[PDB]
Design a protein around this ligand. Structure first.
Ligand SMILES: CC(C)(COP(=O)(O)OP(=O)(O)OC[C@H]1O[C@@H](n2cnc3c(N)ncnc32)[C@H](O)[C@@H]1OP(=O)(O)O)[C@@H](O)C(=O)NCCC(=O)NCCS
Lengths: 383, 383
């Protein structure tokens, strides 16, 4: 009895700004974003769209009436929460029309939250193979206009349906996790933007991959030659490549070329979206599934999840025969291609706008599940 | 192949106020507090003590060198977080000296967070019987001076070590969960105090218990007569009693008296502490274990967990032979009896003090694991 990802999809807001345009606005070479950090288009969202908006849209793309009856646990991994007490998963459970007898909660641990949700969901289904779990990564990565991390911004969500006999990825039991108390990135209660140490963050991310990889190789004997592809969590596409390069220098030239090629395929979507925090790794998985042409049933996919703070985990998934018939490539490509390009001026205006929850008001937004009103701080969503 | 709570303990700050004194200061009949709400002493903490302080002290009371090597997952259930990104479990992992290869994260779902952690931990150990999980409920329940919820305030944490072949409580697979999108209590980002609807909170709590209890009875056929004791989430002691009274009116009188008698034993500690949010249910469990003389190995304990928002769950646990030899009654009684009583003036001063994490500073507190300094918003702890 296999357990894993049966269906998976991502959602990003209907807006974006071109990185060449941003570079010019920031008076820098129109290419240090395309080649330096490796980003081409950045996802941007108005104040009328939050993690629930994204989580709801992504989940709607994969849930059938039968799934809604079989799901008895809803989990949202995020570091962009809108309430200190009420889990965003409760609202998602309502909007998705999931059956009432289910537990719902939010998991927090930076960009690692959704991974924790996925593993816990896996265990749940392993013990109750007739049930399913909805795990959704949702985040809004905003650093600030004219900020150091501004170029790495992103927003969206990745929804996953975990079930027994999954049709896409069967998860293995070779998990290797690590916890280290390091302040590379964090966001004190009350801070709308995160505190970030770039140098320490790059270093901790690269070293954490090296550490869980080495420990994983000790325990399993599995090396790069044993992996058909690797999905990485990434703040920006070049970080991941950096972490990979630092560990594959002793592999054969052909193997290095193969690994780096698989990596490039895993970041196709990311270059058009930006950092999704909890959802970055999973956007990478989706990219591999829909864009990596050499992958086939039985192939082994290695996944490296990272979370500042910091927590990391490496685990493996096996592609299920017929997975290609259960993807959302058409939907995803249309979602990206149909976005409206914003000028830098429109972008800064949309980015700087603040939603004051303390003010009763109504909001206009055509997007389904967007915030429609605020009353006594409570958000209403247009479904 | 049994799975559950191996060790459990709680920690509360070293200060409290007499509810009679609070009543007099608020010009309220003392009986409203002692009898109406069912609270006698309220736990109060200075700004130098946070959820980490409480979680660390609670966990330290039950962790051996062996436990620290076998634990590969650390979970903190809370709704009093100090960071929007970095899980409090990460710092706890460091302070407790737990082996490095573990995953750590925070679960958020109001007063239900710790329960979610316990259930997921249970599945983890079920699949990996050689491993253990540290699950800690930690919260600071502050409503505000002269607020409606002020009398129900509390603070502290409850640490539980989850493992196979547990020495205290063996958990059963009879869980009945429920999720409903209800705004009875919540705390928007940026709000130091929670938004609360007294009436809706009471009614949702009572109706949620009725729903999961009825569904549980439907699925298992088990009724009140089949339970030797019941532990309820305790926002205030009369809460569980109200929910119980609304559901046992049809039972025989002997049965009703037995149920209410066992309930009284479950709230002995809570009457001296107040609301611990995520830890209330589990403080009730500890109270039952350490205070009920007639309970024995083999007895079935029913547990009702509730979290505003709202999520609820009913599940059963069985007392393990020899559990009476693995409790912490002496430690707990000393912890409660040795607290310093604050005058209402001292209480209001301590309660109103704020920590500006944005200010570098040193703090002086004799308590182990209390905050010792703040540098660039980062907290250091005394140890
Ligand atoms: C718990 C809470 C609702 C009580 O608010 P409140 O306005 O003080 O309670 P009320 O004024 O309605 O009356 C208090 C109770 O004591 C009784 N009472 C009042 N004065 C009394 C006195 N002098 N002697 C004895 N009983 C007295 C009342 O009859 C009432 O009993 P009942 O509700 O069981 O019938 C409030 O503190 C709160 O907002 N709590 C936060 C939310 C919460 O904890 N919800 C629980 C669900 S998880």
């Amino acid at each position: 009895m296999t357990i894993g990802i049966d269906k998976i999809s991502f959602f990003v807001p209907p807006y974006y700004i071109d990185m060449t345009a941003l570079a010019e606005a920031r008076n820098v070479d129109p290419g240090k974003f395309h080649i330096g950090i490796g980003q081409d288009q950045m996802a941007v969202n108005p104040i009328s769209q939050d993690i629930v908006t994204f989580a709801a849209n992504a989940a709607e793309a994969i849930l059938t009436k039968e799934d809604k009856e079989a799901i008895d646990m809803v989990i949202v991994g995020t570091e962009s929460s809108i309430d200190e007490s009420k889990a965003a998963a409760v609202v998602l459970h309502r909007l998705m029309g999931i059956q009432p007898f289910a537990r719902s909660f939010e998991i927090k641990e930076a960009c690692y939250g959704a991974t924790a949700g996925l593993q816990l969901a896996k265990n749940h289904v392993a013990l109750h193979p007739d049930k399913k779990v909805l795990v959704v990564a949702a985040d809004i990565a905003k650093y600030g206009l004219n900020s150091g991390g501004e170029p790495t911004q992103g927003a969206g969500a990745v929804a996953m349906l975990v079930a027994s006999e999954p049709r896409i990825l069967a998860l293995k039991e070779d998990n290797v996790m690590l916890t280290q108390d390091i302040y590379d990135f964090w966001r004190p209660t009350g801070h709308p933007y995160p505190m970030v140490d770039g140098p320490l963050s790059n270093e901790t991310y690269i070293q954490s991959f090296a550490q869980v990889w080495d420990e994983h190789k000790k325990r399993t004997g599995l090396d790069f030659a044993d992996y058909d592809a690797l999905a990485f969590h990434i703040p920006y596409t070049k970080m991941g490549k950096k972490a990979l390069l630092a560990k594959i220098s002793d592999q054969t030239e052909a193997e290095q070329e193969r690994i780096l090629a698989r990596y490039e395929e895993s970041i196709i979507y990311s270059r058009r979206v930006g950092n999704l925090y909890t959802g970055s790794l999973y956007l990478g998985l989706i990219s591999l599934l829909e864009n990596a042409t050499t992958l086939t049933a039985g192939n082994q996919i290695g996944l490296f999840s990272y979370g500042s703070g910091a927590v990391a985990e490496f685990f493996t998934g096996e592609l299920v025969a017929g997975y290609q018939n259960h993807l959302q490539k058409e939907t995803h490509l249309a979602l990206l291609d149909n976005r409206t390009e914003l000028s830098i001026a429109e972008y800064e205006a949309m980015f700087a706008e603040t939603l004051d929850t303390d003010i009763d008001q109504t909001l206009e937004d055509e997007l389904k599940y967007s915030i429609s009103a605020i009353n006594n701080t409570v958000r209403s969503y247009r479904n």
